[PDB]
Structures are given as C-alpha cells and as structure tokens.
Symmetry: none
Subunit: 187 residues, 2 copies
C-alpha cells in the first residue's frame, strides 16, 4: 500500500579541509526510472531526507524506487541504496544514468531484458558503456570524468546503443547527475 | 656516511601484448625534491636500477631520496618507494610533481607546512588541485590524463596556488613525469 524512502547524504572530503563543500544538494526520487519528486538536503535537516507516504504497487506491480543526486561540482557521487556519498575529487566528477520504460508496464511483453548505453563527452563517444537491466535497477554511475577540457566545461550525454524495435527513444541530458533515458512503446 | 638506492621497473601490460612497451625508461633520483641524477633502465639490467655511492647526509639532514620516471607514452606511472609500476593505458598517462624546498633545511622556520598546486592543460586550469606536505613527501601523482586534444599533444604544467611569504617560486615543466616546483628562501 504505502511506504517511505529514508536516507542520508555523507560527505567524504577530509572534513571539508578545502572548504569546497556546498550548503545543499538536491535528491531526486525515481519511480520506475521516472523522476517524480525532489528535495533539497541540508545541515538543517542534518543531511537526512525522507519521501513520505508513497504507493508500493502500481496496478499490481511493485514500484521500483531509486534516488539520484543533481551534479555537485568537484564531487564524485556514489549512491548505495538510499545512502548517498559525495567524495571530494577536484576537477573530476560522476555521471548517473537511469532507464525509463514508457510502455504501460510490459503489457505486450516486448520489453527487452536489457539495453546498452554509452557515455558521450562533448559529442565524442567515450567507450564507457553500461548494460542496464533488472539486476542493477536499470541504473549505473560512471566515475573519473573530467569536468574541464582546456578551460572549457565538458558536456556529457548518453545515447542508447541497443535498437529496440517498437520503441522510440528520447534522452534528458540536463544534469549529468540525473541523466534519464526513456523508451516509449509505439507499435 | 654513504648510501645507495635500488629498485625495479615493473610493467603491467600483459607482457607487452600490444607491443607498446618502450626500449627503456628514464628514472630520476631526487634528493629532498631536487633532481641530482638520472639513469636509463633497460631489460639488459632486468629492469632494475641502482644509484650507488650517495652521500647519506647533507647540510644537517639525512637526505630524503625519491625516484620519479620520465613520461612514457601510453603508460600511467605509479611510484611505491623505489618500485616504479607502469600500467598500459592507451591515450592517457600520469603526471608527477615534487616540491623542492631550498631554505637550508628550514633553518629560519619560515616554511609553510602545506602548499597547494594545480595541474594545467595547455595553459588552462583543470581544477585538479593537490596539497603537498611532509606527510606525502611533498609529492603527488595525477592519473587519467589525456595525452591528446583535437589530435594534438597536450602540454601539462603545474602552478603553485599558495603564496609563500619570503619565498620565490620556479617551476620546471619539461617532463610531466617529473614536474618540480622549487621554492627558494629569499628573506
């Protein structure tokens, strides 16, 4: 019926010795790969957060909840089921990608068991690939990405490599911390 | 009265399966952050070297000897004591910087205790800073650095961000594998 997703953010930055830690981060809640809510997490909340009263099932099926964090400058993000860790990595950062299936559940069970996506840097393929499926809640996070390239901020985006007959593909690349790929079923 | 440094060159490239291993490597001997001797190491010596007959003390202190390696295309260098490990990484390498204090073993007690340096890509700030101090031996190695940009080799340099009162700074940026920042005490 109803559940809740509680968690916290932990900073791994040598007790902010460099003084680069921000006053807040924004956590996104995803229901089956779709961003439905956001919350700003701060010290005032003690770096804790919780999404109250949420349905457990979506028309019988069990909704799969996950969380992502909007990109934080100079921090590499590691998400461990609700516990979000930000490691200070000056000049470097991470990127997270989730797959969103828009096909009214698998009605017309034509949904592939897995898909392959690739990370792109300023339009160039990086070679960094990921295979999204149920074993990883259709999510994956890459680390070790440069934030700059000869003084200019590098833009990261993802593209689906798998050709899914029947599905149209659209990608939201507005935040490297919450890159979302949605496949829409259109016979 | 006399001392000597020995060590070995270790290759991590599936026994040169891609045939990119160079015929030799230049190992540098640093006496308290100052380059005092070089040595071309080959398989003729079994990738082992030795800087025999070295003064054990100099102007009041037991000299802190360290080794660095001249940049080798497509390999990422890792120094652990006198053991230099080179890993095969197509398209990227590492950069090593060492702080050289020239203040008569800090006789006047004006030495900082800590300084911050930053890696530059073709004269542009990368954001990748590092803090040098007595704990890490005033040395640091960055990895995952692209050797090329737009088809052209990239020039890597280091800049000292920390302003050191009473000191004048000079940087030797000739080889990214042996970047050396020198601070001379000029009251």
């Amino acid at each position: 019926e109803t559940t809740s997703s509680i968690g916290e953010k932990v900073w791994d930055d040598k007790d902010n010795q460099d003084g680069k830690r921000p006053e807040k981060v924004s956590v996104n809640l995803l229901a089956n790969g779709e961003k439905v809510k956001t919350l700003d997490v701060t010290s005032e909340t003690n770096w804790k957060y919780e999404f109250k009263d949420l349905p457990k099932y979506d028309e019988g099926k069990k909704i799969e909840y996950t969380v992502t964090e909007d990109h934080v400058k100079d921090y590499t993000t590691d998400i461990n089921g609700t516990t979000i860790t930000n490691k200070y990595t000056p000049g470097e950062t991470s990127a997270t990608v989730t797959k969103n299936w828009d096909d009214n559940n698998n009605q017309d069970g034509k949904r592939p068991t897995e898909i392959k996506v690739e990370l792109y840097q300023d339009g160039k393929a990086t070679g960094k690939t990921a295979i999204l499926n149920e074993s990883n809640n259709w999510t994956h996070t890459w680390t070790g990405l440069d934030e700059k390239a000869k003084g200019q901020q590098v833009k990261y985006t993802v593209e689906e490599l798998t050709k899914v007959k029947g599905y149209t593909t659209h990608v939201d690349n507005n935040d490297m911390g919450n890159l979302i790929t949605t496949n829409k079923y259109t016979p």
